[PDB]
């Protein structure tokens, strides 16, 4: 029979895309439905060729190709909300590619995904990728520390956090990583024991001075 009837009862969680190299791609959406469709194709109740693709792992598959044939590229994430026209979020303030050079990358990324028709490459700003991460980290009222350097930012959350400030931080990091991805900005949540959650001062002769962020921390008696 056909492939879209050998799957489950509802034909709403999967999607069967025709390939250009005479294959049949099945577009799942998570890991639990990936093993649901791979069990069907593994036990072999389908007489033709088929593959099960996914948004999380075919975004990791064509990042191995990319750092071999196009190194020192500044990019964020590939979005598969419409799996016949994916969106390639490229960085604007860190690339030197011209108009003729972007079309070769648009064709050589089309050749890796035979189900796709055309890859739409768009350019995002590098300062609105860290502004949304800082405004979201400040809306939850979380103690943090920003470390700007060239080619990426980093946010560090230390301290003896309580049980609410771990759940509000972990619910925000996993919702920011789905949009942007961890190529530019990276969060560093870690638990140690000091009631000064991240900050540290030294005291002499005029008041208090805010020390530089360093790796050594004073252990807290309290």
């Amino acid at each position: 029979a056909e492939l879209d009837s050998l799957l489950g009862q509802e034909k709403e969680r999967f999607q069967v895309l025709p390939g250009r190299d005479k294959m049949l791609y099945v577009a799942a959406q998570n890991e639990r439905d990936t093993l649901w469709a791979r069990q069907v194709l593994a036990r072999g109740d389908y007489d033709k060729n088929a593959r099960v693709i996914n948004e999380n792992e075919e975004n990791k598959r064509i990042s191995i190709w990319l750092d071999t044939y196009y190194p020192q590229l500044a990019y964020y994430r590939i979005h598969f909300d419409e799996p016949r026209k994916p969106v390639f979020w490229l960085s604007r303030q860190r690339n030197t590619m011209s108009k003729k050079e972007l079309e070769v990358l648009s064709q050589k990324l089309r050749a890796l995904m035979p189900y796709a028709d055309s890859v739409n490459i768009t350019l995002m700003d590098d300062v609105t990728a860290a502004g949304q991460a800082e405004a979201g980290l400040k809306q939850q009222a979380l103690p943090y520390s920003r470390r700007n350097h060239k080619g990426g930012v980093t946010f560090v959350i230390q301290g003896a956090l309580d049980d609410v400030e771990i759940l509000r931080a972990r619910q925000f990091v996993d919702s920011y990583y789905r949009t942007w991805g961890g190529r530019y900005v990276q969060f560093a949540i870690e638990l140690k024991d000091d009631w000064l959650k991240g900050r540290s001062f030294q005291y002499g002769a005029e008041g208090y001075i805010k020390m530089s962020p360093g790796h050594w921390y004073f252990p807290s008696p309290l």
Partner: protein
């Protein structure tokens, strides 16, 4: 056709069926009288079925309580053997009391055990608690971390709000459709 587990219990059989049906293989539970249940699968599903038995460590062991290792049939009873049986019934009654809240499906509570502080002249230490919970989805599970903290606070002698640590999550996606028969 081929068996993979046999001689299981009642609650051990429904866990193996509920694990294998999530991963698109259909199994069958057969009763054998006094020899327990038995679970069989088909021909192409056997290779995947041994892999999920090995990964998920099925069949499940019976759950352990601390009062099982201090039985009441002994005519001697040390004070280390009476407080451990007193603590092990409080951390089961608090667990059964957390399941009657609004939207809680399961819960698990732990208490810090102190047995050797009263025998010498040392004062008793403070008592710590910890809890897990699985909530029905659609719940704002960031505001329910303070009702379990309020309920667990003054159910003991003197705790602080730092010593109670509750970490909870929402339940997984529901499995409702049938697996499907392996055709050849």
């Amino acid at each position: 056709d081929k068996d993979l587990l046999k001689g299981l219990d009642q609650e051990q059989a429904n866990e193996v069926i509920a694990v294998l049906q999530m991963h698109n293989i259909e199994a069958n539970k057969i009763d054998s009288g006094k020899l327990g249940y038995s679970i069989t699968v088909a021909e192409p599903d056997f290779t995947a079925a041994v892999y999920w038995i090995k990964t998920y460590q099925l069949p499940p062991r019976p759950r352990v309580e601390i009062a099982q290792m201090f039985p009441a049939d002994s005519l001697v009873s040390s004070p280390r053997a009476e407080k451990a049986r007193l603590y092990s019934a409080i951390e089961q009654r608090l667990e059964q009391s957390l399941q009657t809240m609004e939207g809680v499906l399961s819960a698990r509570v732990h208490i810090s055990y102190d047995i050797d502080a009263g025998e010498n002249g040392r004062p008793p230490k403070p008592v710590h608690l910890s809890a897990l919970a699985v909530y029905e989805r659609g719940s704002p599970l960031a505001h329910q971390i303070s009702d379990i903290k309020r309920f667990l606070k003054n159910s003991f002698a003197d705790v602080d709000y730092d010593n109670i640590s509750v970490v909870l999550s929402e339940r997984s996606d529901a499995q409702l459709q049938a697996p499907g028969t392996p055709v050849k």
